[PDB]
Design an enzyme around this catalytic site. Structure first.
Site, mmCIF file in Angstrom:
data_model
loop_
_atom_site.group_PDB
_atom_site.id
_atom_site.type_symbol
_atom_site.label_atom_id
_atom_site.label_comp_id
_atom_site.label_asym_id
_atom_site.label_seq_id
_atom_site.Cartn_x
_atom_site.Cartn_y
_atom_site.Cartn_z
ATOM 1 N N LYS A 1 -11.921 9.491 48.903
ATOM 2 C CA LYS A 1 -10.948 10.558 48.975
ATOM 3 C C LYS A 1 -10.863 11.340 47.650
ATOM 4 O O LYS A 1 -10.774 12.582 47.681
ATOM 5 C CB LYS A 1 -9.568 10.037 49.368
ATOM 6 C CG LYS A 1 -9.517 9.556 50.827
ATOM 7 C CD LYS A 1 -9.718 10.664 51.808
ATOM 8 C CE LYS A 1 -9.279 10.296 53.243
ATOM 9 N NZ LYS A 1 -9.473 11.362 54.215
ATOM 10 N N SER B 1 -4.993 11.025 50.171
ATOM 11 C CA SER B 1 -4.320 9.739 50.269
ATOM 12 C C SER B 1 -3.671 9.442 48.959
ATOM 13 O O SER B 1 -4.234 9.698 47.915
ATOM 14 C CB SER B 1 -5.333 8.677 50.633
ATOM 15 O OG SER B 1 -4.809 7.339 50.512
ATOM 16 N N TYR C 1 -12.660 3.445 49.944
ATOM 17 C CA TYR C 1 -11.891 4.455 50.645
ATOM 18 C C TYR C 1 -11.202 5.378 49.629
ATOM 19 O O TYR C 1 -11.269 6.596 49.746
ATOM 20 C CB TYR C 1 -10.823 3.786 51.512
ATOM 21 C CG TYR C 1 -9.835 4.742 52.094
ATOM 22 C CD1 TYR C 1 -10.188 5.650 53.069
ATOM 23 C CD2 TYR C 1 -8.515 4.779 51.635
ATOM 24 C CE1 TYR C 1 -9.294 6.526 53.571
ATOM 25 C CE2 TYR C 1 -7.617 5.667 52.159
ATOM 26 C CZ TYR C 1 -8.007 6.500 53.144
ATOM 27 O OH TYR C 1 -7.045 7.367 53.685
#
Ligand SMILES: NC(=O)c1ccc[n+]([C@@H]2O[C@H](COP(=O)([O-])OP(=O)(O)OC[C@H]3O[C@@H](n4cnc5c(N)ncnc54)[C@H](O)[C@@H]3O)[C@@H](O)[C@H]2O)c1
Ligand SMILES: NC(=O)c1ccc[n+]([C@@H]2O[C@H](COP(=O)([O-])OP(=O)(O)OC[C@H]3O[C@@H](n4cnc5c(N)ncnc54)[C@H](O)[C@@H]3O)[C@@H](O)[C@H]2O)c1
Ligand SMILES: O=c1ccn([C@@H]2O[C@H](COP(=O)(O)OP(=O)(O)O)[C@@H](O)[C@H]2O)c(=O)[nH]1
Ligand SMILES: O=c1ccn([C@@H]2O[C@H](COP(=O)(O)OP(=O)(O)O)[C@@H](O)[C@H]2O)c(=O)[nH]1
Lengths: 338, 338
Positions: free
Chosen positions: A153, A124, A149
């Protein structure tokens, strides 16, 4: 090649699987259906022209992963499975670290046991965090991601980098996707999450077909031209093509191969709303709301690396992304059958 | 309090359990015995003056963790279980991220299920990484850790910090231990890993009793006074006391509480060897080997925060650390029985 596509019934995955099947690959989809509908499977198969195998299950179940990898002689793994809402991750950190870090660890542990050494990871743009120069360039360091999040990642990127140092026959792509939007041009496959959409465009599309009253715009006091958040919007079909090119070109090429997959230009939330209003013929209703935790004001890609090395670049504009999502949603206002 | 001590049969754990039991806590030890011997348990009881409960099992077994928490009405968890060798972590990254990151994740997920909200985490000075400001101070940033082990510990710090933001009634101590050495003054409890020791002092001690031919010193070309690595050596009894103080003072204090636990001075590998040769009365056999991956040249703690806040500081010298290890190892050359 024989491709395991985790999260393959989801948004990006379903589009990727169509492209994989069109190119003659064998596809096995693994998904727990927490954010997608089983009925997309036959749409993948009709658009792809070939039957994908489906396994309902969870990347955290390492035993099942090992069974799949062996039962199908898998060549390469494209990993889309995980949780992806920045704001949700701040509220529910443990679920994000479990699905994203533990889930990826469980999957790569099953791969090492089955001797499968080609991995394509859905990373991402949120791994860059607040510090790095914009547009983001892969050759400059990441910083500190601003949500569980994003941190999840980047932790997986690091784990995979250390796996490849220890096990140098692995080929691992870290594909840093920016903000995919749009739908398959048939109008019969698009984004259909479970529950209330966390992402911008499916929320707007559900407002435009009368399912939701109004878009809430998360922040209007950012240091951007119009005060709303700015992102790099990439048509999901162009993204899917990039993923497939990466998989094909990088299989059996040892190393850690890092690419930004984006269009290279930024647009604001209001830009997206305006694009959609022109596509659907009516101003999409919205109201301003507070900033969402985990959001940065603005970022977009430098995607020149993928151009030089993979001969890949975007082909569709934001207006075309909005048109293709409206085409989908208006044909299928409730999404797939359930 | 009712205290769950994961990793409690291990080096720091066993010393910590003796201090807990002397303070009148109820102690439950959970350990998988990968790096310790079950025959330490009666020693911990005798020196502690009180019977601890033992459960053989793995922190990755979430269901077992939840069961222990409920059954024993646990008030606080001191987490020592994990893998700890910097150089090994470079070779075996997946095992480190699984035992350290997933293992801690499984444990704290069990604690959320059981409504236990007090946690004392064994962190490490390796989380500072390439931070050039030395001695390391808690209020200044971490750099990039230089091994999977160091990255695992920092990843867990970050996960815990995000949990406490989402669940602000948690009390979480991030205890950054430096380099514990030494042994209980009785000479009947000390460091006894499985297999060949990875840490400096237990390797030295096993050369001194004739079990190993020669200490390998990893690097002789570092930018230090004698060319060998420099670290902050802390007597394990002082570290145990500091962990116990932190547990008792920080229970039911919501927040993330970060402390360096070290002596606040550096000593080189040759300094430790010379201290041991003085204690045992014979020069310890050694040779130089290449640098070990993951190792930095030199670091030591600023441990003033723990002094001001917890009224804790070191009391034992490097020579005492070496004398106490020799006392243990010469009394028990083979360690604990298998
Ligand atoms: N959509 C974006 O803007 C975007 C941006 C960057 C990166 N990504 C990443 O790309 C991947 C795919 O995103 P998407 O937009 O297609 O999301 P999505 O939610 O549509 O797809 C994820 C799929 O994984 C499944 N899933 C989730 N957790 C699982 C688990 N533990 N085991 C098995 N299946 C599980 C879901 O049911 C779903 O079908 C994700 O890793 C996401 O983090 C997405
Ligand atoms: N010794 C040091 O120099 C040092 C420095 C900083 C931090 N630490 C940290 O302190 C903790 C304890 O260190 P130590 O020196 O006592 O090491 P140790 O190996 O003696 O103790 C760890 C214990 O955990 C057990 N164990 C390992 N993985 C487990 C699992 N998955 N489930 C259950 N039990 C498991 C081992 O059998 C062992 O008894 C570790 O977290 C370590 O990373 C140690
Ligand atoms: O209902 C929504 C969802 C998103 N956004 C904004 O739209 C942009 C894209 O958000 P999305 O969640 O789709 O993806 P992200 O950029 O977090 O990857 C960001 O500026 C969000 O703050 C918004 O205003 N309302
Ligand atoms: O057999 C060994 C073990 C360690 N060391 C050195 O001793 C110091 C302490 O290492 P240890 O492994 O005990 O702990 P670390 O500092 O990695 O936590 C470091 O400079 C190591 O390079 C060594 O030379 N030989």
């Amino acid at each position: 090649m024989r491709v395991l596509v985790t999260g393959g019934s989801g948004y990006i995955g379903s589009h990727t699987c169509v492209q994989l099947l069109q190119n003659g690959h064998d596809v096995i989809i693994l998904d727990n259906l927490c954010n997608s509908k089983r009925s997309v499977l036959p749409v993948i198969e009709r658009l792809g022209g070939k039957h994908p195998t489906f396994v309902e299950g969870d990347i955290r179940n390492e035993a099942l992963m090992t069974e799949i990898l062996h039962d199908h002689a898998i060549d390469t793994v494209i990993h889309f499975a995980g949780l992806k809402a920045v704001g949700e991750s701040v509220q529910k950190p443990l679920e994000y670290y479990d699905n994203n870090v533990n889930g990826t660890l469980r999957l790569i542990s099953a791969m090492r046991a089955a001797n499968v050494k080609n991995f394509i990871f859905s990373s991402s743009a949120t791994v860059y965090g607040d510090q790095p120069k914009i547009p983001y360039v892969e050759s400059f360091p990441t910083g500190t991601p601003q949500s569980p999040y994003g941190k999840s990642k980047l932790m997986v990127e690091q784990i995979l980098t250390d796996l490849q140092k220890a096990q140098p026959d692995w080929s691992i792509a870290l594909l840093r996707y920016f903000n995919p939007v749009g739908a398959h041009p048939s109008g019969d496959m698009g984004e259909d999450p479970q529950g209330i959409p966390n992402n911008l465009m499916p929320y707007i599309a559900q407002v435009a077909v009368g399912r939701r009253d109004s878009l809430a715009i998360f922040g209007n006091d950012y240091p951007t031209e119009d005060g709303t958040g700015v992102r790099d919007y990439i048509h999901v079909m162009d993204l899917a093509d990039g993923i497939v090119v990466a998989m094909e070109k990088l299989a059996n090429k040892p190393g850690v191969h890092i690419y930004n997959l984006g269009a290279g230009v930024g647009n604001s939330v209001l830009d997206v709303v305006n694009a959609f209003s022109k596509a659907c013929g009516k101003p999409v209703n919205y109201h301003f709301a507070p900033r969402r935790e985990g959001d940065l004001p603005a970022y977009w890609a430098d995607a020149s690396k993928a151009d030089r090395e993979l001969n890949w670049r975007v082909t569709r504009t934001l207006d075309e992304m909005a048109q293709d999502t409206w085409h989908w949603q208006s044909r299928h206002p409730q999404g797939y059958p359930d």
